[PDB]
Design an enzyme around this catalytic site. Sequence first.
Site, PDB file in Angstrom:
ATOM      1  N   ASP A  65       0.902  -1.124   0.000  1.00  0.00           N
ATOM      2  CA  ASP A  65       0.000   0.000   0.000  1.00  0.00           C
ATOM      3  C   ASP A  65       0.952   1.187   0.000  1.00  0.00           C
ATOM      4  O   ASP A  65       1.564   1.488   1.012  1.00  0.00           O
ATOM      5  CB  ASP A  65      -0.872  -0.017   1.264  1.00  0.00           C
ATOM      6  CG  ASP A  65      -1.634   1.286   1.483  1.00  0.00           C
ATOM      7  OD1 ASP A  65      -1.599   2.165   0.603  1.00  0.00           O
ATOM      8  OD2 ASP A  65      -2.269   1.432   2.544  1.00  0.00           O
TER       9      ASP A  65
ATOM     10  N   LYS B  73       3.077  11.251  -3.827  1.00  0.00           N
ATOM     11  CA  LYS B  73       1.870  10.666  -4.434  1.00  0.00           C
ATOM     12  C   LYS B  73       0.931  11.741  -4.985  1.00  0.00           C
ATOM     13  O   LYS B  73       0.151  11.467  -5.913  1.00  0.00           O
ATOM     14  CB  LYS B  73       1.184   9.785  -3.392  1.00  0.00           C
ATOM     15  CG  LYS B  73      -0.012   9.002  -3.920  1.00  0.00           C
ATOM     16  CD  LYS B  73      -0.450   8.009  -2.903  1.00  0.00           C
ATOM     17  CE  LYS B  73      -1.632   7.248  -3.402  1.00  0.00           C
ATOM     18  NZ  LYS B  73      -2.159   6.345  -2.354  1.00  0.00           N
TER      19      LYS B  73
ATOM     20  N   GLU C 293      -7.110   0.790  -4.376  1.00  0.00           N
ATOM     21  CA  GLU C 293      -7.089   0.691  -2.912  1.00  0.00           C
ATOM     22  C   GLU C 293      -8.454   0.175  -2.373  1.00  0.00           C
ATOM     23  O   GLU C 293      -8.436  -0.779  -1.620  1.00  0.00           O
ATOM     24  CB  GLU C 293      -6.735   2.059  -2.284  1.00  0.00           C
ATOM     25  CG  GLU C 293      -5.256   2.413  -2.405  1.00  0.00           C
ATOM     26  CD  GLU C 293      -4.906   3.889  -2.330  1.00  0.00           C
ATOM     27  OE1 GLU C 293      -5.701   4.670  -1.767  1.00  0.00           O
ATOM     28  OE2 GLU C 293      -3.833   4.269  -2.848  1.00  0.00           O
TER      29      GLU C 293
ATOM     30  N   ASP D  33     -12.437   5.546   3.650  1.00  0.00           N
ATOM     31  CA  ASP D  33     -11.007   5.662   3.895  1.00  0.00           C
ATOM     32  C   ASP D  33     -10.594   7.060   4.317  1.00  0.00           C
ATOM     33  O   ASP D  33     -10.626   7.996   3.531  1.00  0.00           O
ATOM     34  CB  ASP D  33     -10.251   5.256   2.627  1.00  0.00           C
ATOM     35  CG  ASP D  33      -8.743   5.254   2.807  1.00  0.00           C
ATOM     36  OD1 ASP D  33      -8.256   5.701   3.860  1.00  0.00           O
ATOM     37  OD2 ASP D  33      -8.044   4.805   1.888  1.00  0.00           O
TER      38      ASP D  33
END
Length: 379
Positions: free
Chosen positions: A8, A67, A171, A195
């Site tokens: 991850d 990211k 994800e 999330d």
Amino acid sequence: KAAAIGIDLGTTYSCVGVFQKVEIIANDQGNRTTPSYVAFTDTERLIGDAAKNQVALNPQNTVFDAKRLIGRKFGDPVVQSDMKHWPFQVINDGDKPKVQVSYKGETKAFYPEEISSMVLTKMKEIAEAYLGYPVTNAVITVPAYFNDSQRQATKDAGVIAGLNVLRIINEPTAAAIAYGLDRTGKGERNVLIFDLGGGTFDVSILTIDDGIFEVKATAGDTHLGGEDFDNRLVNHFVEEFKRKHKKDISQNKRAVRRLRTACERAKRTLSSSTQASLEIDSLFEGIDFYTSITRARFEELCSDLFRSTLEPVEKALRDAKLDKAQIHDLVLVGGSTRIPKVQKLLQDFFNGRDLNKSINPDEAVAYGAAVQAAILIKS
Ligand SMILES: Nc1ncnc2c1nc(NCc1ccc3ncccc3c1)n2[C@@H]1O[C@H](CO)[C@@H](O)[C@H]1O
Ligand SMILES: [Cl-]
């Protein structure tokens, strides 16, 4: 050769797992998640905990949020907006962003995928120390909204790190796989993934039809997460120090950064206890900062932010064209879902229904990615 890892690659934290059930690997510091941080010093490159730890003393050369840049053009509105708030320099090389730093006394620039490759190299090394042999097969996760350019650059970071990327998977898909939600049988399974990580909030609605995954909706806030709650604690403490000592500490960056580190720690403790103590030696002008905060005061400081997580859930259901009752499973992902008030708000919003948090929320994605890597490497 026959082994494979799930990674991850998170905005703020990363996690690596191997199916053996899944074993989430603890790093050298013993932590099951690793900061997605790369620091460039006068003598070396630090990755993870060592990088996050020295951020107060080297902010210009401590990179995080790669990211947010990966697979984007320099002229992208998101890049230009984000650049303003980072303490490191972002530069233009052929309309591709690079992070520019001082490393071993020289100016050096890195593509976002190179930085990510260093985080991935650390995750790979962590896996290697656990398995006692080199491992290169991996499944790396990305957000469901990531475009082809973002997915390709993420894959490139894997290749730079020496990993054979078996697949790049979403994800929320990985989190549903971790709970075996693709193995319930024939028919449609509707899954909501909530999330709430370090810096981003993502709601995804997935439909799993006879084992096949479909992303019906995505919503959230790209700029809401754990760091915003740490900052509400920072603001409260700055106000407390002002009332106690009649001094404003806000303009001393080192003091603020040190206070923020103590605030993130107290926040985590407040998820498992109703009180937390801050023990900061010489915070500002040689004054110690020993104080405490209650779970109730913390919930009040973040109340508006916690409540704002419900509007994207309502928008995702609207876009998915599904009602609350049509959702079979409610899955918690991200370290911030550990907060009891966040859980209570989502449970009350879903009329008192149980929330899946059996797998550590900050581990569910790597857990799922490891399961998928094991399926791909066996077949
Ligand atoms: N118990 C909790 N209560 C509220 N929030 C929480 C939380 N555990 C985590 N993360 C897991 C984590 C993060 C850092 C760590 N360093 C050292 C030891 C354990 C650690 C565990 N979070 C937050 O999730 C985000 C991604 O890690 C961060 O904003 C982090 O602060
Ligand atoms: Cl508790």
